[PDB]
Amino acid sequence: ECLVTESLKVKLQWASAFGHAHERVAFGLELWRDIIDDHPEIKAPFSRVRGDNIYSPEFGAHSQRVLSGLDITISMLDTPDMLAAQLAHLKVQHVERNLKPEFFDIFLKHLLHVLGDRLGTHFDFGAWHDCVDQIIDGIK
Amino acid sequence: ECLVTESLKVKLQWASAFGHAHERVAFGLELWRDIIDDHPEIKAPFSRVRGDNIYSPEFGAHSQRVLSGLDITISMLDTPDMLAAQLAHLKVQHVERNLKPEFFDIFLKHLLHVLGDRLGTHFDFGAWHDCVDQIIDGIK
Amino acid sequence: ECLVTESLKVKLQWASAFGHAHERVAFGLELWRDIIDDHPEIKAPFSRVRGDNIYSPEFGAHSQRVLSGLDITISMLDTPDMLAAQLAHLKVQHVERNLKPEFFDIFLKHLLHVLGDRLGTHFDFGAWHDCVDQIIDGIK
Amino acid sequence: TIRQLKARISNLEEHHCDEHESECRGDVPECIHDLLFCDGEKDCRDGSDEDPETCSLNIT
Amino acid sequence: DCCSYEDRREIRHIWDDVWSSSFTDRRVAIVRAVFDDLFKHYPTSKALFERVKIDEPESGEFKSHLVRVANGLKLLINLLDDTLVLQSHLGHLADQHIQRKGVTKEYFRGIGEAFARVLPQVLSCFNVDAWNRCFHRLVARIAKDLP
Amino acid sequence: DCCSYEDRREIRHIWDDVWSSSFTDRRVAIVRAVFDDLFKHYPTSKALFERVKIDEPESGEFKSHLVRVANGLKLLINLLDDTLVLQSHLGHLADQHIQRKGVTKEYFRGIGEAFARVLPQVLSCFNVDAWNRCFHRLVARIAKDLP
């Protein structure tokens, strides 16, 4: 698994990085942009939420909804009973539907890249990789 | 063609983004750098204007001349009679020479990427794509 | 080799860019990150200095040691007797281990990319390319 | 002497008003547009105007 | 009608006191305390959450739920400055409840009363009115399709 | 002659008053009004622009031209702070006129007079001298090449 510290570290850093209000939308946007430019194949399933124009409110909304869920998982994360439950809950919202496996491995790649910029050198890559990974697999 | 608002929007945003004096050279530079790193095949035709060293004054000059033309076309757009004419004029300066059509599709990709940074989330991707596109095809 | 001015220019710009104390570690980190993301094949030889986690102190140390040597070479170069010697000294520390020749061509690519950000438009690409190159070949 | 101090001091802090509005002289802060002077009449409620420090000889 | 900007600011702050730390613990107890008030008044709704195992309060399958609800609210509030996006997710939030068979327009007006009775107890300096106003605008639209 | 940095600043401002409208209408009328003064004085030059259809003033094939001229001037002025580049494009601007058979060193000195007579009418606070000075330095280098 993860370590209790390795979590608190992420729970904490997520705070500074993510931020509040607009600061977030900015984060979300910056994230998805980098992702879609790297793998335009994704603009496909995001057809429902105007994935062609990530600056649009339709997508913007989505963007936020996503990050929010990520917030939950991360906030779940430390305390096992909630995480195990939350993760199971996410798995369902996915299994039903097709998604590629590797897409998430991509999402993670960038989420770390971005937090890297936001947090700087303090960014505990180790802790995040070990920790956010666990969140991806479960949903996955 | 484009919508009369969809133009004014670009005409306006171009203003803030492009800027004045040095602020521009900076823009031009940032733009071409990103373009050439993505597709070094371009350093070829830019041989006349020292395309190997984009920081050089020779290229810098070029860089500016380009953006300027882009400025014209854009401020051209708003009134159809002038645009239709200007565009036709540009097509000629290009047709003669041979180019690869995809280069422009690239140029556009970045011009939007850059404006994205400059303008932020307000950036009306839709308007630009629909509008700058119409300027590229004409030249090609 | 270099020119006399083409050196001083680098010797000077290196100063502003590299910096002092922490400002450096930051530089080093930013550099290696961009390098390893582009060519993860490198995480291999850096196994001794925890290359998997570039934020680690183990790697951080390394990072610095590297940049430092680069500092030397750059300082060296103007006075030929010292450079010729220093370069020869570096060649030895490399020849023995097998390495990829192209790795350095990569390192250089980024070192310039980074200095580009740090220095801005003033960055004398020409001077650096002509100059740092000479430092790489000797090593390689 | 004190008078001259209170002066030197007082001449030098912000005023609320954004440009081309000025405050009425008296007790109330209140801000009115620069232009309205003069009606001939007291633009102001306060009539701060009518006071000498405004209509002064020396100033003019 | 549309909500006053000052009021939004008021709430955007009032919330920062209940949401509070990044901890689950707190937010949980609050959102829970909110639902307990919804169930004590509209007991019918209780059944709706058997899917998340409300019969097992400390389950975790349920706790996590509470959090999702909390966070979903958080997401709303933290969107009050980006209107256009809020207006969309606000819809999306409706659709997620319209497809949930058994959710009445009433239960919502009910959970609204819930907060208005709970919040004023978990923190001081709660502008009940301001909250109420913007919370209604949010609820209305969430129902809004549904009926 | 040389010109003075202050003067450049003066112009870099004076221009921002004539240019200033965003798009075409204004700049057009001005650049046009400039040429009309060039033709009324050096009628000869008129013929040179049959390629752009000057016989059709409102043509558009011609209006666009006017704009290009305007923008070409704009580009110059907006380069006065980057000397080295200006010095190059200034040359490039010459070559584009040397290959235009029929363009005299005179016609330029003529269009220079043009602005000096037009501009002072389209905007107030025009430092005719300052303009004249830096405009000449620009023209000299443009014209000079051709010979």
Added chain:
Amino acid sequence: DCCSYEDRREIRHIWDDVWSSSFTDRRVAIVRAVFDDLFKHYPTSKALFERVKIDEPESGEFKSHLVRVANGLKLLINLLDDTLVLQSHLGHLADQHIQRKGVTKEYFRGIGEAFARVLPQVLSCFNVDAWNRCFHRLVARIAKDLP
């Protein structure tokens, strides 16, 4: 004992006076002058550097060496604000000397005296004590590994 933060600041400055110029020239003469004092006192050590050709002072094969030593010291000092990294490279610096057959724990205590006699001559306002303190902490960890 330990190093105070103030002392670190003192050094982080004292160094900026010896290192400063981009040039080898200066740092060289200093580091050299340091070794000359090491050899005049512990002549035995001299032999250890035949590998770098100390018999050819102006060699370059040797000058470069001096620089590496200098820079290695520079690297140390410029790490005093990042403790954890310093603590590691400080070890790595030991290992590079343990594998160097013939390097005694003494020679180090000797080069320490060296600086303390040289530096106070190349620059004014040298807090010999402060230097001495933090230099010892650095040496101790370097040397110790060896025996």
Added chain:
Amino acid sequence: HEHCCSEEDHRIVQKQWDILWRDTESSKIKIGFGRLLLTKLAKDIPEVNDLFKRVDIEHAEGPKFSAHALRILNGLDLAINLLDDPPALDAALDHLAHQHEVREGVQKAHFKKFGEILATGLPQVLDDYDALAWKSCLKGILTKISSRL
């Protein structure tokens, strides 16, 4: 209602409505914009075309209408610019009511629509738009203008 079109509310509206008149060619804008606004109205409700018949709405670009486009669009300006002086704004609008009262054919449902149109249009020319604030103020205005039938 009472709450709405608060000071902050309109302070916002005012600020955002100004983003428009930054360039001297306000006429070209006001016209084009007002032109479109009225057009899109006649589009959704034709019985309007007959009302604006008097101003040659048939020729959108026709000076007759272009002038009108200004008058109206410019009236909206007045309304907005008087938002910070209720008594004046009130009077200013009441006057607009009377100017519309004696124009038979003009019914309330028209304004309700024009409002919806205006609300969908503004955000297309203004990058910074606060729907909530605007809707709040536009409502108060449109209502007081038609409120007399």
Added chain:
Amino acid sequence: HEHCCSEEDHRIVQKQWDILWRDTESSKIKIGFGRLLLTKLAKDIPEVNDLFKRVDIEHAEGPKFSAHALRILNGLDLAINLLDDPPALDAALDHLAHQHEVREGVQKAHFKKFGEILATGLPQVLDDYDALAWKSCLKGILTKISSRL
């Protein structure tokens, strides 16, 4: 007249010329630079080599010349550093005129060339160079120095 060679003009030159003397090893620079400047002069016009014969220009790195390299290069410094005091600068330069007048062989065309060389060299060591400002000032200097011949 005045306007050419302005306060701003030279204020600039002065600022840019200072980017050079940031490091204590000015000698190494001034020399190398001045050395090159004179060399590149003798390159384009050899009749110069005979003038600088007296200072052993034959040995560029020779102290005899290195010293000279300074004196001249350092004189240019003086000129620049007195740009903000016309009367002084004037006097300072007039003096330089006389020091060149009694050195037969030195003709105007030499300075004109040296100027062109200097103008192509500076921008190679200074990242921030304003050709316009410099040319304006360098002209005034070089001229006054050679006027008396």
Added chain:
Amino acid sequence: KKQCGVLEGLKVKSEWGRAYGSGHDREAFSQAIWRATFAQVPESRSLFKRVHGDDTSHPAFIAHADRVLGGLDIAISTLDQPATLKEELDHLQVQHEGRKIPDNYFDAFKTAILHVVAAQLGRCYDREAWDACIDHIEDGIKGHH
């Protein structure tokens, strides 16, 4: 003095933009103008008896004033393009003919405008130009020669 035409128009149209302004500056700009007008010809107060001309600071009149400048705006603004201006002027022409209007008052009102505008613009303001255009605009309202 001079007559109207393209440039002098553009100038006034631009300068007016600065002098007119918005918000309070406007509510005053107008205020100032009217006070200057009435001060010149107190006789004219009688015409605005309907809109509280007795008290220049009364909301009714404030509205009126702000409302008047409004038209002047359209006039000046539109002035530049003959096609449109023509229309606005013609429109006004109608709202006025059948009314006779003393040319005495218009004169004062122009003066008023000019003095206030000059006070508002500080230094960059061409008098002749405004005079010429305000005139052309007024002529279009009196409509008769």
Added chain:
Amino acid sequence: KAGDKFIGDVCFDHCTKRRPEHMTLAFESSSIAAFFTPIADLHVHIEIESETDEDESEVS
């Protein structure tokens, strides 16, 4: 002290709907705790004479 009445003249009111011209502040009681100098507790009536659209309203 105690018993004081204070009349306030408005000059910037985002705050209320009516914005009133004035606002009287009557101090009913004031007592200091025997141990505490630093803080004196007060009881005050804030009076207001507004005009409403419909009627006139008075508040205390």
Added chain:
Amino acid sequence: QLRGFYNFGKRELLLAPLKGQSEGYGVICDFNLGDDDHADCKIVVPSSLFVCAHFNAQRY
């Protein structure tokens, strides 16, 4: 010789060349120490109102 006015609100003295010189120079002086005597004057170019020179003034 100059022409101009004094802005009450601005506390600023704004003068320009009367005319006919075509190059004349003008001057802007700001009051606002709050003092009378003292002002922050700047000789400008009556065109663009661009600062040709600056001088902190006193009366005389």
